[PDB]
């Protein structure tokens, strides 16, 4: 067996917490899909966590998944967004590396950034521009 | 499984009422384009400020050279093909789809299912950018109409 280890850039072992992410915009499962589309349109976000009234993360709503579900005849604009909760997305820790982040971002369009306290807490969303801006700046 | 089976069997009668409407129902934004001589770092700043994931790269006459995308910029940076001071001309992406205002929303839907965007070109002048179109443009139309 032969192994290869790449030479890593300066930022590789720096941590997700260096990016300076804001708190996420989240939605309740009971607002409509149409209302969620306006919110996401206003902000220029492709996704948001869906959280219940007790603060539990139920999953993510994404534009891709809303579009698929609409095409499949399964959701309409006036339905609750709870109907299109996407439950399989990637998580990363606030103290995980930018290297790990970069792997996730190459395969997925976002990750939910998590931090461990007495329970596992959501810190924010992270997407390619957050990493790009950091490296560029 | 069974749902895919149903959607395949009745694909024709499950086509949305708007399937054969045209992309021009969407009324898009004016496009933000860049020349190939601005840097990758400045491209990243511009796209960050607007909240766009992609822009057309055009020449001094407005002729489309291709697209710059965040995903391809990231890959190119990871592979060491460019650094931020390099011209964005070094990462012109060409494997995207162009469509016209007269193309159906159905054609657009197929494209958006696989890619993050399409480039809308001028109906009789396919070398010029009309606008960019992404999922939220189609979603916004359907929510408006329903
Ligand atoms: C403006 S959006 C542009 C589109 C991009 N594909 C996206 O969805 O992030 C990019 C910026 O918004 C942030 N962002 C995305 N979704 C978020 C949300 N639900 N809450 C707060 N920030 C979010 C990203 O972390 C990034 O800083
Ligand atoms: C604010 S962005 C949000 C993130 C989304 N993933 C994207 O890149 O379009 C969505 C809106 O910006 C528009 N848009 C995207 N790229 C653009 C560009 N280069 N010039 C003008 N509008 C653009 C889209 O057509 C859509 O109306």
Residue numbers in the entry:
A (entry chain A): -7 to -1, 406 to 515, 526 to 545
B (entry chain B): -14 to -1, 406 to 515, 526 to 547
What sentences appear in the manuscript?
Cystathionine β-synthase (CBS,3 EC 4.2.1.22) plays an important role in methionine and sulfur metabolism, and is a unique heme and pyridoxal 5′-phosphate (PLP)-containing enzyme. Its canonical role is the condensation of serine and l-homocysteine (Hcy) to form cystathionine, which can be further metabolized to cysteine or glutathione. CBS adopts a three-domain structure encompassing the N-terminal heme binding, central catalytic, and C-terminal regulatory domains. In mammals, the activity of CBS catalytic domain is increased up to 5-fold by the binding of S-adenosyl-l-methionine (AdoMet) to the regulatory domain, an ∼140-amino acid stretch harboring a tandem module (CBS-1, CBS-2, collectively known as the Bateman motif) found in a number of proteins.
To this end, we constructed the hCBS regulatory domain (aa 406–547) as a standalone N-terminal His6-tagged protein, with the aa 516–525 loop either removed (hCBS-RDΔ516–525) or intact (hCBS-RD), for structural studies. Only hCBS-RDΔ516–525, but not hCBS-RD, was soluble and yielded crystals in the presence of AdoMet, diffracting to 1.7 Å resolution. To our surprise, the structure of AdoMet co-crystallized hCBS-RDΔ516–525 could not be solved by molecular replacement using an AdoMet-free regulatory domain model extracted from our hCBS-FLΔ516–525 structure, but instead by single-wavelength anomalous dispersion with a mercury-derivatized crystal. The hCBS-RDΔ516–525 crystal asymmetric unit contains a “head-to-tail” dimer mediated by a two-fold non-crystallographic symmetry (Cα-r.m.s.d. of 0.241 Å between the two subunits). There is unambiguous electron density for one AdoMet molecule per regulatory domain, bound at the cleft between CBS-1 and CBS-2 modules (inset). Although the topologies of CBS-1 and CBS-2 modules are largely unchanged between the two structures, AdoMet binding is accompanied by an ∼33° rotational rearrangement between CBS-1 and CBS-2, mediated by a bending of the inter-module linkers (aa 422–423, 480–487) that act as the hinge. Relative to CBS-2, the secondary structure elements of CBS-1 (strands β12-β13, helices α18 and α19) are displaced by as much as 8 Å from their AdoMet-free positions, thereby translocating residues (e.g. Phe443-Asp444-Gln445, FDQ motif) into bonding distances with the ligand. The AdoMet pocket in hCBS, occupying the S2 site, is formed on one side by the 443FDQ445 motif in CBS-1, on the other side by the 532GVVTAID538 motif in CBS-2, and at its end by the CBS-1→CBS-2 linker region (aa 414–423). The FDQ motif contributes an aromatic stacking interaction with the AdoMet adenine ring (Phe443), as well as hydrogen bonds with the methionyl nitrogen (Asp444) and carboxyl (Gln445) groups. The GVVTAID motif, highly conserved among CBS module-containing proteins, contributes a bifurcated hydrogen bond to the AdoMet ribosyl oxygens (Asp538) and a hydrogen bond to the methionyl carboxyl (Thr535).
